[PDB]
Amino acid sequence: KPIWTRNPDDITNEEYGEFYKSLTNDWEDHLAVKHFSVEGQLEFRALLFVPRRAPFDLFENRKKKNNIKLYVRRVFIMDNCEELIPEYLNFIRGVVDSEDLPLNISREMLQQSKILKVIRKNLVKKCLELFTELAEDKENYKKFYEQFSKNIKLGIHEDSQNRKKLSELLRYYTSASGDEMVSLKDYCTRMKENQKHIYYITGETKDQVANSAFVERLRKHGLEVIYMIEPIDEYCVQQLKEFEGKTLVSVTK
């Protein structure tokens, strides 16, 4: 039986790795795996993997198609179905096996398919669920975030429906964090009693921004400033107007 039709409880991580490596020709095994099924009026199984390295630089390679393999009742259909998952998750590798799709479905009907849209929404929900489970382990989440932080920020820009969950996955240096990147929830725990806004500064290097005088000003009060040191962060805070009810404020206003 194909591994994706087996019960996840009975599959070792070495069996997943072996399958992951034959599927992707990676020389390393997966960083993470999410194996699940939906049943009832919609019926399908999915076996998704996060690679240990970003497959390409996302921002210089926009609109790359995902490589998930689509099956119908265990018969391979295609492996470049754009609408199976949104672009910011196009690094996800693996297999989706649908029971209800037409076996003879063309790509143009696939594009219009209501079954494909409900499958896609389930993939996103389970990927985000995987990322949050991965955030429980601080050491391996650092590995994921180094490779895919740009994808999370691209999602914040492009996917308002999940913008809340995605924002919980962000990590940043701050004027109070030293060598560690922290979450917005962590920032919120340290806010002063009177503080009603989340302060950030955008810039180019950690050092130039840590030396900046707008930061020094708030350092003189008991106030923490978030370091946003990549160009997507501009787009990112535009749509991330606030968090936990706290408005985001640039220290340069």
Swiss-Prot record:
ISGylated. S-nitrosylated; negatively regulates the ATPase activity and the activation of eNOS by HSP90AA1. Homodimer. Identified in NR3C1/GCR steroid receptor-chaperone complexes formed at least by NR3C1, HSP90AA1 and a variety of proteins containing TPR repeats such as FKBP4, FKBP5, PPID, PPP5C or STIP1. Forms a complex containing HSP90AA1, TSC1 and TSC2; TSC1 is required to recruit TCS2 to the complex. The closed form interacts (via the middle domain and TPR repeat-binding motif) with co-chaperone TSC1 (via C-terminus). Interacts with TOM34. Interacts with TERT; the interaction, together with PTGES3, is required for correct assembly and stabilization of the TERT holoenzyme complex. Belongs to the heat shock protein 90 family. Changing Y20E: Loss of interaction with TSC1 and increases interaction with AHSA1. The gene is HSP90AA1. Changing Y20F: No deffect on the interaction with TSC1. The TPR repeat-binding motif mediates interaction with TPR repeat-containing proteins like the co-chaperone STUB1. Residues 1-253 are annotated as: Interaction with FNIP2 and TSC1. The lineage of its organism: Eukaryota, Metazoa, Chordata, Craniata, Vertebrata. Molecular chaperone that promotes the maturation, structural maintenance and proper regulation of specific target proteins involved for instance in cell cycle control and signal transduction. Undergoes a functional cycle that is linked to its ATPase activity which is essential for its chaperone activity. This cycle probably induces conformational changes in the client proteins, thereby causing their activation. Interacts dynamically with various co-chaperones that modulate its substrate recognition, ATPase cycle and chaperone function. The chain holds residues 294 to 546 of 732 of the full protein. The modification Phosphoserine is found at S160, S183. It comes from Homo sapiens. Residues 1-253 are annotated as: Interaction with NR3C1. It comes from the Eukaryota. The modification N6-acetyllysine is found at K150, K165, K196. This is Heat shock protein HSP 90-alpha. It is found in: Nucleus; Cytoplasm; Melanosome; Cell membrane. The modification Phosphotyrosine is found at Y20, Y199. ATP binds at R107.
